[PDB]
Amino acid sequence: LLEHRLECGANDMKVSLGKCQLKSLGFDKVFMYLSDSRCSGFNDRDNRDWVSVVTPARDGPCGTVLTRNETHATYSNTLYLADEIIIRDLNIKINFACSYPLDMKVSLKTALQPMVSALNIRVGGTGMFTVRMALFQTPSYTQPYQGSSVTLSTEAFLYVGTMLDGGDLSRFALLMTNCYATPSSNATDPLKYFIIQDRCPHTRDSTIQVVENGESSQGRFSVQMFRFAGNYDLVYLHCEVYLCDTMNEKCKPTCSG
Amino acid sequence: LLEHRLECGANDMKVSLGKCQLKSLGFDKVFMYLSDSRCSGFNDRDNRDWVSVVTPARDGPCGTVLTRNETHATYSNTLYLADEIIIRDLNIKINFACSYPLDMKVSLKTALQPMVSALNIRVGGTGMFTVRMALFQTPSYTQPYQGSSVTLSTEAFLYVGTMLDGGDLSRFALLMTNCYATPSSNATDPLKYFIIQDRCPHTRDSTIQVVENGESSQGRFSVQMFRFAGNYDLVYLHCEVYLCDTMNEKCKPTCSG
Amino acid sequence: LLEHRLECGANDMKVSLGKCQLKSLGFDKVFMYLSDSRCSGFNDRDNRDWVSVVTPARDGPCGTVLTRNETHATYSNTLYLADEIIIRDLNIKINFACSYPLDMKVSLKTALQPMVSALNIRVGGTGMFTVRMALFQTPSYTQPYQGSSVTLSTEAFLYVGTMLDGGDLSRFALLMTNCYATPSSNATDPLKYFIIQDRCPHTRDSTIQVVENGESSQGRFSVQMFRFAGNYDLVYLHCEVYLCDTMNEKCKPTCSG
Amino acid sequence: LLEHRLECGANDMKVSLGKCQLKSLGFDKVFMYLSDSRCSGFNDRDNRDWVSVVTPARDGPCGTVLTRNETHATYSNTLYLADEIIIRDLNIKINFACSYPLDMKVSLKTALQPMVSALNIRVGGTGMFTVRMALFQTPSYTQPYQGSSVTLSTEAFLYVGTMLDGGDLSRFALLMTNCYATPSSNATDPLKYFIIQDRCPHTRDSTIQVVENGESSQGRFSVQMFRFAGNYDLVYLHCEVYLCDTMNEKCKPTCSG
Ligand SMILES: *[C@@H]1O[C@H](CO)[C@@H](O[C@@H]2O[C@H](CO)[C@@H](O[C@@H]3O[C@H](CO[C@H]4O[C@H](CO[C@H]5O[C@H](CO)[C@@H](O)[C@H](O)[C@@H]5O)[C@@H](O)[C@H](O)[C@@H]4O)[C@@H](O)[C@H](O[C@H]4O[C@H](CO[C@H]5O[C@H](CO)[C@@H](O)[C@H](O)[C@@H]5O)[C@@H](O)[C@H](O)[C@@H]4O)[C@@H]3O)[C@H](O)[C@H]2NC(C)=O)[C@H](O)[C@H]1NC(C)=O
Ligand SMILES: *[C@@H]1O[C@H](CO)[C@@H](O[C@@H]2O[C@H](CO)[C@@H](O[C@@H]3O[C@H](CO[C@H]4O[C@H](CO[C@H]5O[C@H](CO)[C@@H](O)[C@H](O)[C@@H]5O)[C@@H](O)[C@H](O)[C@@H]4O)[C@@H](O)[C@H](O[C@H]4O[C@H](CO[C@H]5O[C@H](CO)[C@@H](O)[C@H](O)[C@@H]5O)[C@@H](O)[C@H](O)[C@@H]4O)[C@@H]3O)[C@H](O)[C@H]2NC(C)=O)[C@H](O)[C@H]1NC(C)=O
Ligand SMILES: *[C@@H]1O[C@H](CO)[C@@H](O[C@@H]2O[C@H](CO)[C@@H](O[C@@H]3O[C@H](CO[C@H]4O[C@H](CO[C@H]5O[C@H](CO)[C@@H](O)[C@H](O)[C@@H]5O)[C@@H](O)[C@H](O)[C@@H]4O)[C@@H](O)[C@H](O[C@H]4O[C@H](CO[C@H]5O[C@H](CO)[C@@H](O)[C@H](O)[C@@H]5O)[C@@H](O)[C@H](O)[C@@H]4O)[C@@H]3O)[C@H](O)[C@H]2NC(C)=O)[C@H](O)[C@H]1NC(C)=O
Ligand SMILES: *[C@@H]1O[C@H](CO)[C@@H](O[C@@H]2O[C@H](CO)[C@@H](O[C@@H]3O[C@H](CO[C@H]4O[C@H](CO[C@H]5O[C@H](CO)[C@@H](O)[C@H](O)[C@@H]5O)[C@@H](O)[C@H](O)[C@@H]4O)[C@@H](O)[C@H](O[C@H]4O[C@H](CO[C@H]5O[C@H](CO)[C@@H](O)[C@H](O)[C@@H]5O)[C@@H](O)[C@H](O)[C@@H]4O)[C@@H]3O)[C@H](O)[C@H]2NC(C)=O)[C@H](O)[C@H]1NC(C)=O
Ligand SMILES: *[C@@H]1O[C@H](CO)[C@@H](O[C@@H]2O[C@H](CO)[C@@H](O)[C@H](O)[C@H]2NC(C)=O)[C@H](O)[C@H]1NC(C)=O
Ligand SMILES: *[C@@H]1O[C@H](CO)[C@@H](O[C@@H]2O[C@H](CO)[C@@H](O)[C@H](O)[C@H]2NC(C)=O)[C@H](O)[C@H]1NC(C)=O
Ligand SMILES: *[C@@H]1O[C@H](CO)[C@@H](O[C@@H]2O[C@H](CO)[C@@H](O)[C@H](O)[C@H]2NC(C)=O)[C@H](O)[C@H]1NC(C)=O
Ligand SMILES: *[C@@H]1O[C@H](CO)[C@@H](O[C@@H]2O[C@H](CO)[C@@H](O)[C@H](O)[C@H]2NC(C)=O)[C@H](O)[C@H]1NC(C)=O
């Protein structure tokens, strides 16, 4: 028939009923007692007109009894409800209880910042990233060629490329900047024929075609095979590469005039 | 206080300290952390007992930072050194870094051998090497005589020689094999008096003496002058020479009996 | 397809091709190498625009090889022909060689003129040329008569002549200048009858006729026989002759008035 | 130093030296040349071992030169003397020449004997030789007596003789054979007194004496004068004479008993 506002703070229990009792149960005048009848109710106004009692959550200050469990401390008492000093039709009692946990967690809000003497040691060094080169037997760059020598007719079409195996593959593209054939295993020699001379292919010779350079970890290009004029019989391939920053630079070169 | 083993490969950085920390710093138990504290150290055994961490040379996989220059990519992180979960006397930190060049050079190891159609043209011919002869005015073979005729008494002593001027002087010695006087400018005539007849001088006549033949580019010999008996008045000198292989033959002849 | 100019001197070999290669083989630009590729060609102009190389005829200065025979020293090398640093359709090579004889003949050009003391001996003497005379039995002067005496009637016709047997027959004609009969074997005697008196016959007597005198080696004439008047019985014939220069004189006399 | 044998025939000149050159000039071996050096010497043996050359007496067959004069044809050449093919101490030359006359005399040796018709005329006659007689006035027969008559006393002594004047005085002596006195001029008369009767005087008469008869051209005798007895007065003398062959006869008579 009635609403029930129960609040429990750390120090005291409060219990109240509203102005619903102005009509409900016919309570023209309202009495409210706890088990110690010296503790009577009053009329609060902070939120609404409320009829209420207040009892400390202690053993016995208004007769309240404390039940003790492993998980909680429980306090209990009873409101007695009446419209008169004496009653004759219905003994109305509101039995109420509330509990508190005994297990809780806490923390300091101040952060502590320590300071300490310190020793600073430095060391340092260097290393390199593996790059390799390969010649292919097949159009689609697919197939390995291991042999320490390959013989070809001059009508044959080499396919070739370079690969970045080492690491940091998202940051560095493999960019060829210079690539050339020599008649010697020493890569420094006075006679060079150029396929890629300055970040661009030597497209003046129509038999050179480039597939991919600077966009990935594996560069690809192709050219018809040839023989050095003069008293020569072997062809060696040498090139120069550069690890190109994929974040702070355009790595794909423009080859034009 | 401590040694430092730093290795950098193409994929990962490794950093280690040895069992020197078994006594040094009192590290009964050893902790080792990088800037991402989820990456902790371990105990390696491939060479010695080493305490070490391993981090890929990438952006951030254990908090490692990459600094970028024009000449190098540099990676850096820090070891934290401790004997306990918590510390109180010295914050020990090892700051380390290593770098990699961005400019590198590469090569193919396979040699390429081309084949090609060929055209073969031959030509050929012949030539000769200049040899000359001279008469001298003086003992030491020194002096020229240009004149188109020389008059001498019969008490006079001619000095004469031949010279190889043409070329290939290290391979061919000038060897006289035959030399004779005629009463005529035609060198073929029926009357001959011999100075050198068959690779040797006609030493039967005591007035002939040879200096050098077959050892050099200039041969030398001498003989008292004479007149052809009969109705004759002029003397002409003619000889035959041979270019002698200094490598595959003894060129100095032996004149004996 | 091409001409070939090969010259070999005593010191160096020269080899060249002309401007035929301006169109031939499409050689827009011309490369020319020997087996040592450091020796390259050049553009000569002394006769025409020629493309050429020059190599000393030695062992190895541009890789040239020397083959040695008994008769010759032979040098050989190869031109490599190309229109580009590198080639792809035809390896064009010109193989060339030239040789030199090892056996040669030489001479001094100065003539030598000796002088010598001399001894001069003279001797000298004299001699004579045989001439003979004959009487003939027959008209055509043909027949010999040996007999130490011949008897004739006075109606008989002697035929007579003289002959030059001795020598120098082209230079000397036999010329009779005087001829006469005596009554004695002494040829000097006071009585003479003349047939030929002074380079001419005594034609006043009609019985004398001359055939040939001064034109040949055998003179001929005839006269009817006769007897000396008086106490005489024998006839002897005597004559005088002269050897006439056939080169510096007319030998045929003119007999007239 | 050397002898020189020079002979010249009608056809050829010969010139030689002997074995004196075996020691002289040291000519161990002997060379001998003329001006045409193709004509060399040889070793003759017909008389001795001689070294010699032979050249026809013509223009140029071994280079010999002919000089022509009015009196002679002269030929000249030179020997060259040597002990070797070539010489050095003395050029030895023998200059020689010989000549032939151009004027010569010749004869036929056959004698010619003519025969001829002949005419024979004879004539003939006779003559006489003058003899005379004389009377003398004086003892020595000396004096003439011309007178046509002489008177004498009878004591007188006539002297008388005869003379042969005519001729042939060497062949004929005048021989008186008969002589007598007559008393008459007719010499035939019957009375004769004889002085010489028969080749002898009538010496019985002591007054007759004969001087010379038959030995010469003049006979002589004498007798005392006398007169014929009887009638007579004149005395005449007559005699008979005979021409006596002085070659085939004794002409002096012997008068005896
Ligand atoms: C130690 O001691 C402590 C302190 O006593 C014990 O902790 C307490 O345990 C109690 C028992 O579980 C909790 O009580 C409540 O029990 C109700 C069940 O019984 C009542 O309801 C039945 C109705 O359900 C029945 O339906 C039919 C019949 O109708 C049956 O056939 C059927 O079988 C059902 O049982 C009645 O029949 C019965 O007679 C009882 O009257 C639960 O319903 C109740 O659940 C409530 O949970 C919360 C409580 O409010 C809090 O949360 C809300 C969240 O929105 C918040 O708004 C509030 O302000 C509160 O903070 C609400 O959702 C409802 O009110 C539910 O009804 C309870 O379970 C005590 O709550 C509990 N005390 C606590 C936790 O502080 C502890 O168990 C002991 N330890 C031991 C024994 O080891
Ligand atoms: C782009 O970015 C790249 C990457 O960072 C740059 O390349 C780096 O340049 C750095 C600067 O030159 C190099 O660092 C090292 O610098 C040292 C100098 O400073 C330190 O040392 C001083 C001591 O010397 C001083 O003495 C007194 C005081 O004591 C002073 O008064 C005096 O003036 C001196 O300065 C300290 O004072 C100072 O505070 C610093 O601590 C150099 O000594 C050092 O040289 C070392 O060189 C090699 C390195 O090891 C390699 O080679 C050996 C060969 O045997 C091999 O064994 C190893 O394994 C390595 O391969 C060793 O011989 C010694 O360790 C030397 O000490 C350096 O020069 C970086 O090394 C360099 N990084 C490279 C090259 O990868 C680049 O310059 C930038 N590009 C620009 C700016 O254009
Ligand atoms: C020691 O070593 C010396 C140096 O090598 C030797 O001397 C050399 O001997 C060589 C061999 O004889 C000479 O070579 C030349 O050989 C040619 C023959 O073979 C080539 O030709 C054949 C064609 O003839 C064939 O026809 C058919 C097929 O087509 C066959 O069925 C047939 O049987 C024929 O063989 C090819 O088949 C063959 O494969 C070869 O290619 C000769 O023809 C050549 O003669 C040339 O002679 C002169 C050379 O030029 C000089 O003279 C001219 C004169 O006008 C002048 O103008 C030049 O400037 C030169 O001065 C030319 O008239 C032509 O060019 C001829 O073709 C040769 O005979 C070498 O020449 C020779 N080297 C000399 C001499 O310096 C020597 O023999 C060795 N001693 C030994 C072994 O004892
Ligand atoms: C036409 O051409 C013909 C042919 O040439 C001419 O005939 C020739 O004339 C020549 C000149 O007369 C004759 O030559 C001989 O000349 C000698 C003289 O000169 C040489 O001798 C001198 C020595 O005498 C000198 O002494 C001192 C110095 O020492 C002086 O001071 C002095 O004044 C003297 O000159 C040298 O000085 C001089 O340099 C010359 O060397 C004559 O001596 C020589 O007489 C020789 O006569 C005969 C020759 O031999 C023949 O006869 C002998 C008889 O027994 C016989 O045995 C031989 O077999 C020969 O048949 C010998 O008795 C001696 O040998 C004498 O020395 C000559 O007179 C040529 O003989 C002569 N040729 C003939 C004749 O065939 C002709 O004259 C021309 N017609 C003209 C010009 O009209
Ligand atoms: C590569 O080849 C060269 C010769 O072609 C070798 O020699 C070097 O050549 C360069 C110029 O081409 C010179 O600057 C050096 O001084 C030379 N070095 C020597 C040691 O001579 C060179 O050594 C070769 N490289 C190798 C074999 O790795
Ligand atoms: C050299 O002289 C000779 C004559 O002495 C010249 O004639 C040749 O002689 C040889 C034998 O000596 C013969 O086999 C040849 O047939 C001759 N040739 C002629 C053309 O007659 C020879 O010509 C001279 N050489 C020269 C002038 O160079
Ligand atoms: C030739 O006959 C004459 C006589 O008729 C010989 O005598 C010579 O005669 C010439 C004159 O006729 C004189 O000048 C000489 O003096 C004479 N010589 C002598 C020696 O008397 C002459 O000898 C005869 N010739 C001969 C025989 O050969
Ligand atoms: C000489 O005298 C006589 C006479 O005495 C002459 O007469 C001759 O005499 C001889 C005899 O005596 C006779 O035989 C002759 O016959 C006589 N001749 C004549 C002619 O009578 C004689 O004639 C006288 N002579 C003279 C004169 O001369």
Describe the structure.
- Four copies of one chain form a homotetramer.
- Chain A has 257 residues and is mainly beta.
- Chain A folds into two domains: 5-101, Zona pellucida, ZP-N domain (Immunoglobulin-like); 131-245, Zona pellucida, ZP-C domain (Immunoglobulin-like).
- Chain A has strands at residues 5-8, 12-17, 31-33, 42-44, 50-56, 65-68, 72-82, 92-101, 118-126, 131-136, 149-151, 157-164, 172-182, 193-196, 208-212, 218-224, 227-228, 236-245.
- A four-stranded antiparallel sheet of chain A has the order 1-2-5-4, with no helix packed on it. In chain A, strands 3, 6, 7 and 8 form a four-stranded antiparallel sheet that branches.
- In chain A, a hairpin with a 5-residue loop joins strand 4 and strand 5 (50-56).
- The radius of gyration of chain A is 47 Å and the shape is rod-shaped.
- Chains in contact: A-B, A-C, B-C, B-D, C-D.
- Chains B and C meet through strand 11, strand 12, strand 13, strand 14 and strand 20 of B and strand 1, strand 9, strand 10 and strand 11 of C.
- The structure holds a molecule of 7 linked components (NAG-NAG-BMA-MAN-MAN-MAN-MAN) (4 copies) and a molecule of 2 linked components (NAG-NAG) (4 copies).
- A molecule of 7 linked components (NAG-NAG-BMA-MAN-MAN-MAN-MAN) binds at residues 69, 71-72, 74, 99 of chain D.
- Chains A, B, C, D: Disulfide bonds join 8-98, 39-62, 179-239, 200-255, 244-251.
- Chains A, B, C, D: Residues 127-257 are annotated as: ZP-C.
- Chains A, B, C, D: Residues 7-102 are annotated as: ZP-N.
- Chains A, B, C, D: Residues 103-126 are annotated as: Flexible ZP-N/ZP-C linker.
- Chains A, B, C, D: Residues 7-257 form the ZP domain.
